[PDB]
Amino acid sequence: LPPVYPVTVPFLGHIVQFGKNPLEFMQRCKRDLKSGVFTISIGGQRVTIVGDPHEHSRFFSPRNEILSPREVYTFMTPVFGEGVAYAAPYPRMREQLNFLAEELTIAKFQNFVPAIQHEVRKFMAENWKEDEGVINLLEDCGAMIINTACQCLFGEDLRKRLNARHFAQLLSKMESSLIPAAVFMPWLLRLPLPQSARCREARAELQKILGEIIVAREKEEASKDNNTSDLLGGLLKAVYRDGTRMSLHEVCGMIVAAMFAGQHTSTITTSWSMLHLMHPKNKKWLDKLHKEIDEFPAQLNYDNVMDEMPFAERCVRESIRRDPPLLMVMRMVKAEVKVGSYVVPKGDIIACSPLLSHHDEEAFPNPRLWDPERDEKVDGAFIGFGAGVHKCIGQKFALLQVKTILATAFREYDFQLLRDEVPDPDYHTMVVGPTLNQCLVKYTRKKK
Ligand code: HEM
Ligand SMILES: C=C(CC[C@@H](C)[C@H]1CC[C@@]2(C)C3=C(CC[C@]12C)[C@@]1(C)CC[C@H](O)[C@@H](C)[C@@H]1CC3)C(C)C
């Protein structure tokens, strides 16, 4: 019932083309097969891709039992470790998930904007020192966000310890971790992974060491001199539902994950956004962005970013729309499911691509055009943050981070993209972002 693309090489499959260009390969699969839904073989494994925006509801709705993400996202354990992310089943993953959620509440967001905005201005005075100057944005942002993410989630104690090493190293230690065309084949990363074997463990060291000093540093007990409800402190104090406590190797793995989600996708998104806004073709938009923020005070607050920054969010979302950081959302088909006229059978890897769907013509016309005031012409087409049972729970914070950054930066600077056109998407990484070497930019301080 479901279609399949022709397989020239049986064992390798289409992983050759998909790697060279996944956007044009998938669009070519969809176009030639003459169907939104289709199947491809990656390493003797049927991968059914949903390219029809109207059928998104089929993909994202079903429960974990019908479509499981665990056994497809096993490739991620080398990055966090054991007992983190999709290593545990529902209960323990839900347990850690709600530890994160506990730190991401409507109440705790009151600190975030002041905390973020301070950290930005700090980094800005630290790295962008002269009135003018040249610096590549992707790496400078990667640092920016590592502070703002850490400051909000883990608090003031860590942002301090990590410093110049995490400012650039944890950034790099994470930038390093990325690996392409291995997810579909989890067998490859097992024996010979390129660096994540050393980098994740080397990364694991630096924070295991500062995880051991933290007991000797603060009083933080019965003096009530600081009401610390941060993530880490509570994360190593925490006990699971089954009685067992967090391991030192585990809490380390969590701190890594929280920072990954808080930084990697957000920094990509922060960059794309700025790149688009500083282009000359989008001056009409940049002008509009200033009309929005120019009446704010120096000290922004929660209400300013949430309630009073509509267009900035539009720019951020459309940037995530055009070049979605996560290409392929995937599930293990542990039970049959109807998807339009076809059926997808048990045992398959069913997947849905934000990249593909965001470039569907009906939903998004002239999809390569960054138009922040556009809207999804098909409902539920945009899946940048996913949807359904596994919808991103960090969407608020991500948008808060980015919008705040944009507000703080563009208020006190002007940027000149040292290129004719905007950077290409570097699809070498599965976690996609603008091409590193194309991101060189002249900053220019603003003065009244
Ligand atoms: C631009 C920023 C971000 C993007 C593009 C993004 C993207 C995504 C996507 C596509 C998914 C769904 C994957 C799927 O359906 O299988 C998702 C889920 C999730 N994201 Fe994000 N995310 C972002 C920021 C964040 C942040 C800041 C956090 C935490 C601070 C976070 C934590 C999560 C969690 C916990 C899930 C749950 C998925 C599950 O239940 O299996 N994300 N994210
Ligand atoms: C840090 C969290 C969990 C956050 C986890 C679930 C997030 C962070 C990175 C995310 C978004 C990633 C996910 C989905 C969920 C992850 C693992 C995936 C696996 C989505 C599928 C993509 O193909 C792949 C590139 C990304 C990798 C990053 C708690 C353990 C505290």
Q: Say how far apart CA 113 and CA 297 lie, in whole Å.
A: 13
Ligand showing the shortest atom-to-Cα distance for residue 384: 1
- How far is residue 22 from each of residues 25, 27, 61, 422, measured CA to CA in Å? 5, 8, 25, 19
Q: State which amino acid sits at residue 447.
A: K
Q: State which amino acid sits at residue 377.
A: K
Q: Say how far apart CA 190 and CA 38 lie, in whole Å.
A: 29
Residue nearest (by alpha carbon) to ligand 1 atom 8: 385
Which tokens in the block code for residue 63? 């429960």
Residue nearest (by alpha carbon) to ligand 2 atom 7: 261
Report the 10 Å Cβ neighbour count for 6.
10
Residue pair 100/231 in contact by the 8 Å Cβ criterion: yes
Report the 10 Å Cβ neighbour count for 196.
18
Q: Say how far apart CA 179 and CA 10 lie, in whole Å.
A: 23
- CA-326 nearest atom, ligand 1: 10
- CA-386 nearest atom, ligand 2: 20
Burial per residue of 39-65, b for 16 or more beta-carbon CB atoms within 10 angstroms, e otherwise:
bbbbbeebbbbbbbbbbbebbbebeee
Residue pair 43/14 in contact by the 8 Å Cβ criterion: no
Backbone angles phi, psi at 394, to 5 degrees: -105, 10
Residue pair 338/321 in contact by the 8 Å Cβ criterion: no
Residue pair 357/51 in contact by the 8 Å Cβ criterion: yes
Residue pair 49/56 in contact by the 8 Å Cβ criterion: no
Q: Say how far apart CA 204 and CA 251 lie, in whole Å.
A: 10
- Angle, in degrees to the nearest 10, between helices 156-164 and 137-153: 150
Q: Say how far apart CA 341 and CA 2 lie, in whole Å.
A: 8
Regarding beta strands 329-333 and 349-352, do their DSSP bridges make them parallel or antiparallel, or are they unpaired? antiparallel
Dihedral (CA of 436, 442, 445, 448) sign:
negative
Q: Say how far apart CA 44 and CA 18 lie, in whole Å.
A: 15
Distance of CA 352 from the midpoint of ligand 1 (Å):
15
Which tokens in the block code for residue 192? 């010979």
- CA-387 nearest atom, ligand 1: 15
DSSP 8-state code for residue 363: T
Residue pair 207/252 in contact by the 8 Å Cβ criterion: yes
Q: State which amino acid sits at residue 437.
A: N
- How far is residue 81 from each of residues 68, 70, 75, 438, measured CA to CA in Å? 20, 14, 10, 33
Q: Say how far apart CA 111 and CA 254 lie, in whole Å.
A: 22
Q: Say how far apart CA 407 and CA 429 lie, in whole Å.
A: 29
CB 328 less than 6 A from any atom of ligand 1: no
Name residues contacting ligand 2 (CB within 6 A). 73, 76, 84-85, 96-97, 100, 183, 254, 257-258, 260-261, 326, 328-329, 430-431
- Structure obtained using: X-ray
Q: Say how far apart CA 86 and CA 271 lie, in whole Å.
A: 29
Q: Say how far apart CA 370 and CA 379 lie, in whole Å.
A: 19
- Rg (C-alpha) for the chain, rounded Å, is 22
DSSP 8-state code for residue 76: G
Residue pair 422/273 in contact by the 8 Å Cβ criterion: no
- The full DSSP string for 392-441 is -S-HHHHHHHHHHHHHHHHHSEEEEESSSSPPPEETTSSB-EE-GGG-EE
Mutate to test the pocket of ligand 2, among 184, 326, 327 (most ligand atoms within 8 A of CB): 326
Q: Say how far apart CA 177 and CA 200 lie, in whole Å.
A: 7
Beta bridge partners of 56: none
Name all domains of the chain by residue range, CATH numbers in brackets.
1-448 (1.10.630.10)
- The full DSSP string for 80-137 is H-SSSTTSS-HHHHHHHHHHHHHTS-TTTHHHHHHHHHHHHHHHHHHH--SSEEEEEH
Regarding beta strands 132-136 and 329-333, do their DSSP bridges make them parallel or antiparallel, or are they unpaired? unpaired
- How far is residue 253 from each of residues 11, 89, 208, 351, measured CA to CA in Å? 35, 17, 10, 27
Report the 10 Å Cβ neighbour count for 373.
10
